[model samples]
Target: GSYIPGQPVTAVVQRVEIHKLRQGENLILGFSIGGGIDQDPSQNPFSEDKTDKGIYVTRVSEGGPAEIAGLQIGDKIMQVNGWDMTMVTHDQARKRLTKRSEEVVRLLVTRQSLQKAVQQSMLS
Candidate 1:
């Protein structure tokens, strides 16, 4: 992910090796994040923090890959497989995430949810 000058950025990465044993063929990332990539925010459905152009997670699946990885409802995504998702559409992210060809997807998320974890780690 290229650095966006003027504003600081945070990258959170998680590795999920999922099985296809679900009641379907190709399993999904098991969560949802939303936002737009273009400067024209007019087409965006999810209104969010303008400073945060990336996907802001709206939900975490139950007993899903994301839950196991500690993703929350407020996590903001930065990149996947080095591809910048800051302005990617939800459909675009879905298409990329549904592919089973890549066994390892580096899911990067950002949010206050991590602060607690980081604090716990620092305390420990």
Candidate 2:
């Protein structure tokens, strides 16, 4: 059900910076992550290329900080706030996202739709 990017493929990389606002006591990013170093890559819903153990956005909460930031489900996370996410564990990734000290999360992610756009460009 997911589309994975090819290793050697040239695709679009999106940069998203989310400033999480406090909703009472908890800081809300409104997103969940999947496919980390410790998790089963095959179980990832965001990628068909299961060989790659990259973190992906499994879900997005409606009207949340992440949603408002334009972060989408199935986007493969490459970096977070200058931290390289390629070799981090699921727990590690969670900690990074939940870090209370940093209210802003800057992410570099790759998307299947962006690759499709590249394909579409070839037709024209």
Candidate 3:
């Protein structure tokens, strides 16, 4: 057993630790976020019901920090640097990800169940 504690647990939960690299005064995590508590749930394509406000990974930059960390598109962000993102607004979540002071972003995310598993297997 991994014996994980304190952090929320779920099936197929993934811990993404990204070390931001500075390029021309910009620290890039190489990922884009979509969906948030303050945003219209109808706009969230990742959510199956189209009514969930959960923050999800909309894009991952190729060969970047997030991609190297194995952060996948459509993953639900549970926590960002230990801050709960489940209820945060869209801008709030963006600020958390882009905090200038933090060079490392520790993310707790959950992947889709059987739906994604089948796709992954097919790809492999």
Candidate 4:
């Protein structure tokens, strides 16, 4: 399980991994997005008045499945596996994704009306 995102979200270093590399090669370290604590329903990206249609990748974990799947911060998530996310709550969304088995999850996102499919790994 991962830490829940919310108030006073803090960053901590848990472990380190070492890898072998060719001489003179540089190492690239990536960080995951954080601080996903639930906000007021009214504040949600898809709420009325917001009128946002795409799913928003508010936080991404470093080296996590999402990163490998090419999901980026601020990427609007419009649908999950062909289902619109508009009527779902954050918790509902989490549950739906968590219960699925496909390691590679397909998401439809709309950025300025340009819809695209993004394949991301499961959160677990």
Tell me which of candidates 2 and 4 scores higher on lDDT. Answer: 2
Candidate 2's residue-wise lDDT over 5-123, tens digit each?
Answer: 33346555777777876766877566778867677645545554444667778876566777787778877778888897777887888888755667888887776445433223224
Q: Candidate 3 regions off by >4 Å?
A: 1-11, 113-124
lDDT of 4 by residue, 20-103 (tens): 222234222121211123434244432211343323556543555455555555544445554554346556565544333333
- Model 2 pairs in collision: none
User: lDDT of each prediction vs. the true structure?
Assistant: 0.54, 0.69, 0.70, 0.38
Could you report the Cα RMSD, in angstroms, for every candidate shown? 8.1, 8.0, 5.0, 16.2
How do these models rank on TM-score, best leading? 3, 2, 1, 4
- Alpha-carbon runs more than 4 Å astray in model 4: 1-55, 112-124
> For model 2, what is the alpha-carbon lDDT of residue 32?
76
Model 2 misplaced regions, further than 4 Å: 1-10, 113-124
* lDDT for predicted candidate 2 compared with the true structure: 0.69
lDDT of 3: 0.70
Please name the candidate that would achieve the greatest lDDT relative to the true structure. Answer: 3
What tens digits encode model 3's per-residue C-alpha lDDT throughout 1-124?
6866333443467788888767568876778788677767544556542355677788875677887887888787878888877777778888887656678888877765335232332234
Minimal lDDT window, size 10, model 3: 113-122
Best by TM-score: 3
TM-score of 2: 0.74
lDDT of 1 by residue, 19-42 (tens): 322426766666665544632334
